[PDB]
Design a protein around this nucleic acid. Structure first.
Length: 105
DNA sequence: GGGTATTCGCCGCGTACCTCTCCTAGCCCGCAAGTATCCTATTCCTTGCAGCGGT
């Protein structure tokens, strides 16, 4: 498994695309339609910034990954994930959240 | 969502020794060597100007 992939909890395909400069990823993406870490195609990024030339940041590549990682709190995420793992559901999400919590702790 | 099947990709496949060969490709710029050419002489001829005896 890829430690980045499941620490940040993003499918490895999308990090593969981002880290070789063929897409865009939002960093904070607040005060707008976008979420924390949506992926964008080049044209999608151009269109989004056109309609939303406000301050939402969407970077491209290693710098974006670094900012996204450095912009996270570990133990708080651990609390949220253990609360969610409390139940709903112990079928495969049980295994997934146990692994992610193991890495985070 | 969720239990399940199917696919993709990574990991692995004996020890010790002996002999031999071969180990980047391509451009480029100084540079040695070798050469064809150009200026350098000699001999003949017919002019153009300065001295010069002569009166």
């Amino acid at each position: 498994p890829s430690r980045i992939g499941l620490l940040l909890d993003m499918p490895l395909r999308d990090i593969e695309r981002v880290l070789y400069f063929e897409s865009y990823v939002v960093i904070e993406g607040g005060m707008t339609n976008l979420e924390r870490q949506q992926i964008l195609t080049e044209e999608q990024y151009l269109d989004a910034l056109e309609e939303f030339g406000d301050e939402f940041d969407a970077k491209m590549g290693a710098e974006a990954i670094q900012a996204l990682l450095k912009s996270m709190d570990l133990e708080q995420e651990c609390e949220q994930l253990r609360e969610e793992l409390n139940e709903t559901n112990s079928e495969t999400k049980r295994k997934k959240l146990t692994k992610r919590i193991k890495l985070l702790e």
